[PDB]
mmCIF file of the C-alpha atoms, coordinates in Angstrom:
data_MODEL
# 
_entry.id   MODEL 
# 
loop_
_atom_site.group_PDB 
_atom_site.id 
_atom_site.type_symbol 
_atom_site.label_atom_id 
_atom_site.label_alt_id 
_atom_site.label_comp_id 
_atom_site.label_asym_id 
_atom_site.label_entity_id 
_atom_site.label_seq_id 
_atom_site.pdbx_PDB_ins_code 
_atom_site.Cartn_x 
_atom_site.Cartn_y 
_atom_site.Cartn_z 
_atom_site.occupancy 
_atom_site.B_iso_or_equiv 
_atom_site.pdbx_formal_charge 
_atom_site.auth_seq_id 
_atom_site.auth_comp_id 
_atom_site.auth_asym_id 
_atom_site.auth_atom_id 
_atom_site.pdbx_PDB_model_num 
ATOM 1   C CA . UNK A 1 1   ? -3.554  -0.686  18.901  1.00 0.00 ? 1   UNK A CA 1 
ATOM 2   C CA . UNK A 1 2   ? -0.173  -1.570  17.318  1.00 0.00 ? 2   UNK A CA 1 
ATOM 3   C CA . UNK A 1 3   ? 2.268   1.264   17.881  1.00 0.00 ? 3   UNK A CA 1 
ATOM 4   C CA . UNK A 1 4   ? 4.083   2.054   14.633  1.00 0.00 ? 4   UNK A CA 1 
ATOM 5   C CA . UNK A 1 5   ? 4.153   5.520   13.064  1.00 0.00 ? 5   UNK A CA 1 
ATOM 6   C CA . UNK A 1 6   ? 3.450   6.129   9.405   1.00 0.00 ? 6   UNK A CA 1 
ATOM 7   C CA . UNK A 1 7   ? 6.778   6.888   7.688   1.00 0.00 ? 7   UNK A CA 1 
ATOM 8   C CA . UNK A 1 8   ? 9.025   5.327   10.359  1.00 0.00 ? 8   UNK A CA 1 
ATOM 9   C CA . UNK A 1 9   ? 12.554  4.681   9.086   1.00 0.00 ? 9   UNK A CA 1 
ATOM 10  C CA . UNK A 1 10  ? 12.516  0.987   10.173  1.00 0.00 ? 10  UNK A CA 1 
ATOM 11  C CA . UNK A 1 11  ? 8.872   0.217   9.353   1.00 0.00 ? 11  UNK A CA 1 
ATOM 12  C CA . UNK A 1 12  ? 9.736   -2.809  7.183   1.00 0.00 ? 12  UNK A CA 1 
ATOM 13  C CA . UNK A 1 13  ? 11.530  -4.490  10.142  1.00 0.00 ? 13  UNK A CA 1 
ATOM 14  C CA . UNK A 1 14  ? 8.576   -3.813  12.442  1.00 0.00 ? 14  UNK A CA 1 
ATOM 15  C CA . UNK A 1 15  ? 5.956   -5.165  10.030  1.00 0.00 ? 15  UNK A CA 1 
ATOM 16  C CA . UNK A 1 16  ? 7.966   -8.283  9.129   1.00 0.00 ? 16  UNK A CA 1 
ATOM 17  C CA . UNK A 1 17  ? 6.712   -9.809  12.447  1.00 0.00 ? 17  UNK A CA 1 
ATOM 18  C CA . UNK A 1 18  ? 3.048   -9.118  11.684  1.00 0.00 ? 18  UNK A CA 1 
ATOM 19  C CA . UNK A 1 19  ? 0.373   -11.636 10.728  1.00 0.00 ? 19  UNK A CA 1 
ATOM 20  C CA . UNK A 1 20  ? -2.732  -10.348 8.888   1.00 0.00 ? 20  UNK A CA 1 
ATOM 21  C CA . UNK A 1 21  ? -4.419  -9.853  12.293  1.00 0.00 ? 21  UNK A CA 1 
ATOM 22  C CA . UNK A 1 22  ? -1.733  -7.518  13.683  1.00 0.00 ? 22  UNK A CA 1 
ATOM 23  C CA . UNK A 1 23  ? -1.622  -5.553  10.418  1.00 0.00 ? 23  UNK A CA 1 
ATOM 24  C CA . UNK A 1 24  ? -5.313  -4.782  11.143  1.00 0.00 ? 24  UNK A CA 1 
ATOM 25  C CA . UNK A 1 25  ? -4.316  -2.975  14.319  1.00 0.00 ? 25  UNK A CA 1 
ATOM 26  C CA . UNK A 1 26  ? -2.279  -0.310  12.465  1.00 0.00 ? 26  UNK A CA 1 
ATOM 27  C CA . UNK A 1 27  ? -3.285  3.359   12.544  1.00 0.00 ? 27  UNK A CA 1 
ATOM 28  C CA . UNK A 1 28  ? -2.876  3.590   8.750   1.00 0.00 ? 28  UNK A CA 1 
ATOM 29  C CA . UNK A 1 29  ? -3.619  1.627   5.617   1.00 0.00 ? 29  UNK A CA 1 
ATOM 30  C CA . UNK A 1 30  ? -1.167  -1.080  4.639   1.00 0.00 ? 30  UNK A CA 1 
ATOM 31  C CA . UNK A 1 31  ? -1.118  -3.169  1.490   1.00 0.00 ? 31  UNK A CA 1 
ATOM 32  C CA . UNK A 1 32  ? 1.532   -5.752  0.652   1.00 0.00 ? 32  UNK A CA 1 
ATOM 33  C CA . UNK A 1 33  ? 2.125   -6.400  -3.067  1.00 0.00 ? 33  UNK A CA 1 
ATOM 34  C CA . UNK A 1 34  ? 4.338   -8.854  -4.883  1.00 0.00 ? 34  UNK A CA 1 
ATOM 35  C CA . UNK A 1 35  ? 6.592   -7.690  -7.734  1.00 0.00 ? 35  UNK A CA 1 
ATOM 36  C CA . UNK A 1 36  ? 3.735   -7.927  -10.203 1.00 0.00 ? 36  UNK A CA 1 
ATOM 37  C CA . UNK A 1 37  ? 1.348   -5.778  -8.188  1.00 0.00 ? 37  UNK A CA 1 
ATOM 38  C CA . UNK A 1 38  ? -0.751  -8.658  -6.809  1.00 0.00 ? 38  UNK A CA 1 
ATOM 39  C CA . UNK A 1 39  ? -2.237  -8.026  -3.351  1.00 0.00 ? 39  UNK A CA 1 
ATOM 40  C CA . UNK A 1 40  ? -0.881  -10.331 -0.622  1.00 0.00 ? 40  UNK A CA 1 
ATOM 41  C CA . UNK A 1 41  ? -2.109  -8.437  2.444   1.00 0.00 ? 41  UNK A CA 1 
ATOM 42  C CA . UNK A 1 42  ? -4.627  -5.609  2.823   1.00 0.00 ? 42  UNK A CA 1 
ATOM 43  C CA . UNK A 1 43  ? -5.496  -4.262  6.271   1.00 0.00 ? 43  UNK A CA 1 
ATOM 44  C CA . UNK A 1 44  ? -8.679  -3.010  7.900   1.00 0.00 ? 44  UNK A CA 1 
ATOM 45  C CA . UNK A 1 45  ? -7.573  0.659   8.026   1.00 0.00 ? 45  UNK A CA 1 
ATOM 46  C CA . UNK A 1 46  ? -7.101  0.569   4.237   1.00 0.00 ? 46  UNK A CA 1 
ATOM 47  C CA . UNK A 1 47  ? -10.608 -0.840  3.818   1.00 0.00 ? 47  UNK A CA 1 
ATOM 48  C CA . UNK A 1 48  ? -11.971 1.945   6.005   1.00 0.00 ? 48  UNK A CA 1 
ATOM 49  C CA . UNK A 1 49  ? -10.386 4.565   3.776   1.00 0.00 ? 49  UNK A CA 1 
ATOM 50  C CA . UNK A 1 50  ? -11.328 3.034   0.443   1.00 0.00 ? 50  UNK A CA 1 
ATOM 51  C CA . UNK A 1 51  ? -14.482 1.003   0.980   1.00 0.00 ? 51  UNK A CA 1 
ATOM 52  C CA . UNK A 1 52  ? -12.911 -2.200  -0.330  1.00 0.00 ? 52  UNK A CA 1 
ATOM 53  C CA . UNK A 1 53  ? -13.464 -5.391  1.646   1.00 0.00 ? 53  UNK A CA 1 
ATOM 54  C CA . UNK A 1 54  ? -9.963  -6.711  2.637   1.00 0.00 ? 54  UNK A CA 1 
ATOM 55  C CA . UNK A 1 55  ? -10.617 -10.435 2.116   1.00 0.00 ? 55  UNK A CA 1 
ATOM 56  C CA . UNK A 1 56  ? -12.115 -9.794  -1.288  1.00 0.00 ? 56  UNK A CA 1 
ATOM 57  C CA . UNK A 1 57  ? -9.191  -7.930  -2.808  1.00 0.00 ? 57  UNK A CA 1 
ATOM 58  C CA . UNK A 1 58  ? -6.422  -10.308 -1.766  1.00 0.00 ? 58  UNK A CA 1 
ATOM 59  C CA . UNK A 1 59  ? -5.151  -12.066 -4.867  1.00 0.00 ? 59  UNK A CA 1 
ATOM 60  C CA . UNK A 1 60  ? -6.337  -9.293  -7.222  1.00 0.00 ? 60  UNK A CA 1 
ATOM 61  C CA . UNK A 1 61  ? -3.903  -7.138  -9.168  1.00 0.00 ? 61  UNK A CA 1 
ATOM 62  C CA . UNK A 1 62  ? -3.747  -3.670  -7.581  1.00 0.00 ? 62  UNK A CA 1 
ATOM 63  C CA . UNK A 1 63  ? -2.858  -1.764  -10.758 1.00 0.00 ? 63  UNK A CA 1 
ATOM 64  C CA . UNK A 1 64  ? -5.039  -3.563  -13.241 1.00 0.00 ? 64  UNK A CA 1 
ATOM 65  C CA . UNK A 1 65  ? -8.109  -4.588  -11.237 1.00 0.00 ? 65  UNK A CA 1 
ATOM 66  C CA . UNK A 1 66  ? -8.489  -2.697  -7.996  1.00 0.00 ? 66  UNK A CA 1 
ATOM 67  C CA . UNK A 1 67  ? -6.896  0.705   -8.475  1.00 0.00 ? 67  UNK A CA 1 
ATOM 68  C CA . UNK A 1 68  ? -6.881  1.801   -12.120 1.00 0.00 ? 68  UNK A CA 1 
ATOM 69  C CA . UNK A 1 69  ? -6.459  5.420   -11.026 1.00 0.00 ? 69  UNK A CA 1 
ATOM 70  C CA . UNK A 1 70  ? -2.940  4.445   -9.847  1.00 0.00 ? 70  UNK A CA 1 
ATOM 71  C CA . UNK A 1 71  ? -1.999  3.027   -13.283 1.00 0.00 ? 71  UNK A CA 1 
ATOM 72  C CA . UNK A 1 72  ? 0.045   6.072   -14.295 1.00 0.00 ? 72  UNK A CA 1 
ATOM 73  C CA . UNK A 1 73  ? 3.699   7.142   -14.352 1.00 0.00 ? 73  UNK A CA 1 
ATOM 74  C CA . UNK A 1 74  ? 3.152   8.883   -10.982 1.00 0.00 ? 74  UNK A CA 1 
ATOM 75  C CA . UNK A 1 75  ? 2.221   5.814   -8.980  1.00 0.00 ? 75  UNK A CA 1 
ATOM 76  C CA . UNK A 1 76  ? 2.533   2.525   -10.933 1.00 0.00 ? 76  UNK A CA 1 
ATOM 77  C CA . UNK A 1 77  ? 5.521   3.966   -12.821 1.00 0.00 ? 77  UNK A CA 1 
ATOM 78  C CA . UNK A 1 78  ? 7.377   4.552   -9.533  1.00 0.00 ? 78  UNK A CA 1 
ATOM 79  C CA . UNK A 1 79  ? 6.440   1.092   -8.297  1.00 0.00 ? 79  UNK A CA 1 
ATOM 80  C CA . UNK A 1 80  ? 7.703   -0.671  -11.426 1.00 0.00 ? 80  UNK A CA 1 
ATOM 81  C CA . UNK A 1 81  ? 10.962  1.370   -11.432 1.00 0.00 ? 81  UNK A CA 1 
ATOM 82  C CA . UNK A 1 82  ? 11.500  0.274   -7.821  1.00 0.00 ? 82  UNK A CA 1 
ATOM 83  C CA . UNK A 1 83  ? 10.766  -3.420  -8.383  1.00 0.00 ? 83  UNK A CA 1 
ATOM 84  C CA . UNK A 1 84  ? 13.174  -3.562  -11.330 1.00 0.00 ? 84  UNK A CA 1 
ATOM 85  C CA . UNK A 1 85  ? 15.880  -1.793  -9.346  1.00 0.00 ? 85  UNK A CA 1 
ATOM 86  C CA . UNK A 1 86  ? 15.419  -3.897  -6.199  1.00 0.00 ? 86  UNK A CA 1 
ATOM 87  C CA . UNK A 1 87  ? 15.002  -0.757  -4.069  1.00 0.00 ? 87  UNK A CA 1 
ATOM 88  C CA . UNK A 1 88  ? 12.003  1.492   -3.349  1.00 0.00 ? 88  UNK A CA 1 
ATOM 89  C CA . UNK A 1 89  ? 11.301  4.182   -0.759  1.00 0.00 ? 89  UNK A CA 1 
ATOM 90  C CA . UNK A 1 90  ? 9.089   7.074   -1.822  1.00 0.00 ? 90  UNK A CA 1 
ATOM 91  C CA . UNK A 1 91  ? 6.345   9.194   -0.307  1.00 0.00 ? 91  UNK A CA 1 
ATOM 92  C CA . UNK A 1 92  ? 3.862   11.391  -2.208  1.00 0.00 ? 92  UNK A CA 1 
ATOM 93  C CA . UNK A 1 93  ? 0.281   12.671  -2.074  1.00 0.00 ? 93  UNK A CA 1 
ATOM 94  C CA . UNK A 1 94  ? -2.311  11.162  -4.429  1.00 0.00 ? 94  UNK A CA 1 
ATOM 95  C CA . UNK A 1 95  ? -6.049  11.215  -5.035  1.00 0.00 ? 95  UNK A CA 1 
ATOM 96  C CA . UNK A 1 96  ? -8.016  7.947   -5.024  1.00 0.00 ? 96  UNK A CA 1 
ATOM 97  C CA . UNK A 1 97  ? -11.134 8.385   -7.125  1.00 0.00 ? 97  UNK A CA 1 
ATOM 98  C CA . UNK A 1 98  ? -12.254 5.117   -8.685  1.00 0.00 ? 98  UNK A CA 1 
ATOM 99  C CA . UNK A 1 99  ? -15.824 4.116   -7.725  1.00 0.00 ? 99  UNK A CA 1 
ATOM 100 C CA . UNK A 1 100 ? -15.520 6.256   -4.611  1.00 0.00 ? 100 UNK A CA 1 
ATOM 101 C CA . UNK A 1 101 ? -15.669 9.839   -3.406  1.00 0.00 ? 101 UNK A CA 1 
ATOM 102 C CA . UNK A 1 102 ? -12.353 11.471  -4.456  1.00 0.00 ? 102 UNK A CA 1 
ATOM 103 C CA . UNK A 1 103 ? -10.127 11.100  -1.404  1.00 0.00 ? 103 UNK A CA 1 
ATOM 104 C CA . UNK A 1 104 ? -6.735  12.818  -0.924  1.00 0.00 ? 104 UNK A CA 1 
ATOM 105 C CA . UNK A 1 105 ? -4.099  10.566  0.741   1.00 0.00 ? 105 UNK A CA 1 
ATOM 106 C CA . UNK A 1 106 ? -0.396  10.432  1.535   1.00 0.00 ? 106 UNK A CA 1 
ATOM 107 C CA . UNK A 1 107 ? 1.212   7.279   0.121   1.00 0.00 ? 107 UNK A CA 1 
ATOM 108 C CA . UNK A 1 108 ? 4.463   5.710   1.245   1.00 0.00 ? 108 UNK A CA 1 
ATOM 109 C CA . UNK A 1 109 ? 5.847   2.860   -0.917  1.00 0.00 ? 109 UNK A CA 1 
ATOM 110 C CA . UNK A 1 110 ? 8.704   0.803   0.473   1.00 0.00 ? 110 UNK A CA 1 
ATOM 111 C CA . UNK A 1 111 ? 10.397  -2.477  -0.362  1.00 0.00 ? 111 UNK A CA 1 
ATOM 112 C CA . UNK A 1 112 ? 9.663   -5.097  2.292   1.00 0.00 ? 112 UNK A CA 1 
ATOM 113 C CA . UNK A 1 113 ? 12.409  -6.895  4.242   1.00 0.00 ? 113 UNK A CA 1 
ATOM 114 C CA . UNK A 1 114 ? 11.202  -10.056 2.428   1.00 0.00 ? 114 UNK A CA 1 
ATOM 115 C CA . UNK A 1 115 ? 12.450  -10.818 -1.086  1.00 0.00 ? 115 UNK A CA 1 
ATOM 116 C CA . UNK A 1 116 ? 9.824   -10.016 -3.709  1.00 0.00 ? 116 UNK A CA 1 
ATOM 117 C CA . UNK A 1 117 ? 7.347   -7.945  -1.718  1.00 0.00 ? 117 UNK A CA 1 
ATOM 118 C CA . UNK A 1 118 ? 6.594   -4.237  -1.426  1.00 0.00 ? 118 UNK A CA 1 
ATOM 119 C CA . UNK A 1 119 ? 4.529   -2.207  0.943   1.00 0.00 ? 119 UNK A CA 1 
ATOM 120 C CA . UNK A 1 120 ? 2.051   0.574   0.130   1.00 0.00 ? 120 UNK A CA 1 
ATOM 121 C CA . UNK A 1 121 ? 1.084   2.595   3.224   1.00 0.00 ? 121 UNK A CA 1 
ATOM 122 C CA . UNK A 1 122 ? -1.737  5.107   3.112   1.00 0.00 ? 122 UNK A CA 1 
ATOM 123 C CA . UNK A 1 123 ? -3.133  7.780   5.423   1.00 0.00 ? 123 UNK A CA 1 
ATOM 124 C CA . UNK A 1 124 ? -5.660  10.571  5.022   1.00 0.00 ? 124 UNK A CA 1 
ATOM 125 C CA . UNK A 1 125 ? -4.416  14.155  4.513   1.00 0.00 ? 125 UNK A CA 1 
# 
């Protein structure tokens, strides 16, 4: 297993070195989005939590296609405020309930070290 703790202060530096295969060794869900919300990376732990097949969601828009329950001021609204500002670091609890059993999770959104990319980390609560 890859040893990185959910919510670590330097998580973006640690994950910058990770290929899709190493991202799959994380103890929590990790999704990398571009500024428009398109999925660039989606790890195995995230698929375990949500039921989505990782390879199938890459390239889809997270807010429009995959996760409509997140299209709200409380999730997507925070993401879009962060992209526009060029800075994002927020953690909050949320319930995923689209085409799945309602599941309570802790979400951490953070701007990646890379230019136009943002991370969404997820763990069960």
